[PDB]
Amino acid sequence: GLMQFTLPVRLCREIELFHFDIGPFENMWPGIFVYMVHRSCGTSCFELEKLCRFIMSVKKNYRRVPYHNWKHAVTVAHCMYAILQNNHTLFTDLERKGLLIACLCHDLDHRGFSNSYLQKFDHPLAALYSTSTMEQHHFSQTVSILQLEGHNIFSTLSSSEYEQVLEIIRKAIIATDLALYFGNRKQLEEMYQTGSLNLNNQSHRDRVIGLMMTACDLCSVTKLWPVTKLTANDIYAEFWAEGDEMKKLGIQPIPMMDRDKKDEVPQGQLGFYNAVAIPCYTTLTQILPPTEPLLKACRDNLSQWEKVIRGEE
Ligand SMILES: Cc1cc(Cl)c(C)n2nc(CCc3nc(N4CCCC4)nn3C)nc12
Ligand SMILES: [Mg+2]
Ligand SMILES: [Zn+2]
């Protein structure tokens, strides 16, 4: 009732920053997440007992893969928290509620394989969800966990509010399908430039939330360089295992997934920051000026990859 969550001083201060790293102590991550809900939403948003039980079931449904794991979920939520806290007035009570939850749940039960590998392996999920395969699965898992006894953190919401929140969550989670991001950022680019962008048009909010989700999801590129570099190892550990699996199916994997192309990593990161990351944080900074530190950090890390290529590290 009168129970606050507090973090040690360095965390208390640094968690407010975009480049915060949640650290290696897994047992502190639930507390960190709850801390973020309480400041971002209010101590009255969710029934504490239910929330903790929800957090633990979510944790239990992430798998021990090198990248798309429980640490990633909490990291993507922390980036969303920073966005929300730096844009206080722009978001409904329901969005604040739904978005941190969406981030925590966005990769639920990920297996460490891309949509493309599932389709080529012909996994049951690819038959059930022909596009955004994993992402529809992630949302499905969120609904399941929400329906477990004592797990309904949205129990105090009205029937229509409940339906609205699940709908924010659904679209948010779908938007993490990077294949959808390009078209989404293009529309947003154009709408901002022709001045048509309207935060009262619901379909416009959706696109903006979608862009936020991409930004949070890629936030590894906005951290301090050693964090960025070390996460990159986890990212390729997954991709290369998928690459191996492609080869097992009799298929040349794309260069990104082929461990024989280890040497081109610095250059693959370059293309990635240029094709994906920078454009994402750019348009996001245009639409939401106080998120500029993400762009600035992303640019610093691109420069670090450039330095890696030039033999300077
Ligand atoms: C989804 C995602 C998210 C994030 Cl936060 C990052 C930092 N990354 N990096 C990547 C791989 C980029 C890449 N590497 C390569 N190759 C070709 C041969 C050597 C490497 N090509 N590309 C496009 N993906 C992601
Ligand atoms: Mg995902
Ligand atoms: Zn993700």
Specify the CATH number for the domain of residue 216.
Answer: 1.10.1300.10
Listed in sequence order, the residues at least 6 apart from 143 whose beta carbon sits closer than 8 Å to its beta carbon are: 166
Please, are residues 36 and 17 in contact by the beta-carbon 8 Å criterion? no
Q: Is 305 helix (H, G, I), strand (E, B) or coil?
A: helix
Nearest to 186 by CA among 270, 272, 275, 103: 275
From CA 313, how far away is CA 311, in angstroms rounded? 5
d(CA 101, CA 37): 9
Do 228 and 237 contact (CB within 8 A), yes or no? no
**Position of tokens 């639920």?**
108
Q: Which two tokens stand for residue 34?
A: 């709850």
Closest atom, ligand 1, to C-alpha of 263: 19
Residue 68 appears among annotated catalytic residues: yes
DSSP 8-state secondary structure symbol assigned to residue 311: T
DSSP designation for 271: H
Residue 15, phi then psi, degrees to nearest 5: -65, -20
Tokens of 211: 């862009």
Contact 113, 65 (CB under 8 A): no
- CA dihedral of 36, 37, 42, 48, whole degrees rounded to 10: -120
Q: Which atom of ligand 1 is nearest to the CA of 275?
A: 23
- Let me know: does 232 contact 121? Beta carbons within 8 Å: no
User: How many residues make up the chain in this entry?
Assistant: 313
The token pair that represents 257 in the structure block = 């997934």
Please pick, among 68, 110, 137, 138, the residue that the annotation labels catalytic.
68
Q: Is the separation of the CB atoms in 260 and 275 below 8 Å?
A: no
Known binding-site residue numbers:
68, 72, 106-107, 217, 269
What is the experimental method?
X-ray
**By three-state DSSP, how is residue 8 classified?**
coil
DSSP annotation of 201: S
Burial of 2 (0-12, 13-18, 19+ CB in 10 A): exposed
**Radius of gyration from C-alpha coordinates of the chain:** 19
Of 53, 56, 24, 51, the C-alpha closest to 36 is 51
Distance (Å) of CA 277 to CA 216, 222, 262, 300:
11, 9, 21, 12
Q: What is the Cα–Cα distance from 118 to 124, expressed in whole angstroms?
A: 8
Rounded to an integer, what distance in angstroms lies between the CA atom of residue 238 and that of residue 91? 35
Rounded Cα distance between 52 and 30, Å, is 8
CB contact at 8 A, 173 and 139: yes
The phi, psi pair for 250, rounded to 5°, reads 85, 35
What does DSSP assign to residue 27? Answer: G
The CA distance from 282 to 287, in Å, is 9
Q: How far apart are CA 170 and CA 102, in angstroms?
A: 8
User: Quick one: which H or E segment has residue 55?
Assistant: helix 48-60
Q: Which amino acid is at 38?
A: H
Query: Which residue segment(s) compose the domain that 112 sits in?
Result: 1-313
Does the beta carbon of 301 lie inside 6 Å of ligand 1?
Answer: no
CA distance 258 to 111: 18
User: Is there an atom of ligand 1 within 6 Å of 272 CB?
Assistant: yes
Q: How far apart are CA 180 and CA 207, in angstroms?
A: 11
Resolution of the experimentally solved model in angstroms:
2.2
Among candidate residues 210, 213, 190, the one with its CA nearest the CA of residue 202: 210
List CB contacts of 261: < 8 A, sequence separation 6 or more: 255, 268
Number of domains in the chain: 1
Residues 6+ apart with CB under 8 A from 84: 40, 91, 96, 99, 100
